[PDB]
């Protein structure tokens, strides 16, 4: 019913923000994205959560790359959520970062097999 990210509990805010500062200066054409499975999803967790994403990639391109990391069957649907809404397909990841990044300078995206996050 609302986004929950285990990553934020595991890493206290001040540590996250320091890392976000550094990674934005080191890789300025990339956006740092934390990717987690939504609770209740029947998908399986990524082996790694921390992705650097060229700002020019479209959201749709990002969808496909995450799908390949889950080794997800083509017939299994996959939806993404940022701040409780499904992002626009035409946006670039740089544009999504501009609108939705948090105060640690990361962008948080959840995925699920369901079109409703809390389901």
């Amino acid at each position: 019913g609302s986004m929950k990210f285990v990553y934020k509990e595991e890493h206290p805010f001040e540590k996250r923000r320091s890392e976000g500062e550094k990674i934005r200066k080191k890789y300025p054409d990339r956006v740092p994205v934390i990717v987690e499975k939504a609770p209740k999803a029947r998908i399986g967790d990524l082996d790694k959560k921390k992705y650097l994403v060229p700002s020019d990639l479209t959201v749709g391109q990002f969808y496909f790359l995450i799908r390949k990391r889950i080794h997800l069957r083509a017939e299994d649907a996959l939806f993404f959520f940022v701040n409780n809404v499904i992002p626009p397909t035409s946006a670039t990841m740089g544009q999504l970062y501009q609108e939705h990044h948090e105060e640690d300078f990361f962008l948080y995206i959840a995925y699920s097999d369901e079109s409703v996050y809390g389901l």
């Binding site: 890392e19 790694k48 921390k50 790359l65």
Partner: peptide, 13 residues
């Protein structure tokens, strides 16, 4: 890449 980050297109750590 650095700090455990994965470059998403190439898979470079």
């Amino acid at each position: 890449l650095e700090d455990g980050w994965v470059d998403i297109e190439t898979g470079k750590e």
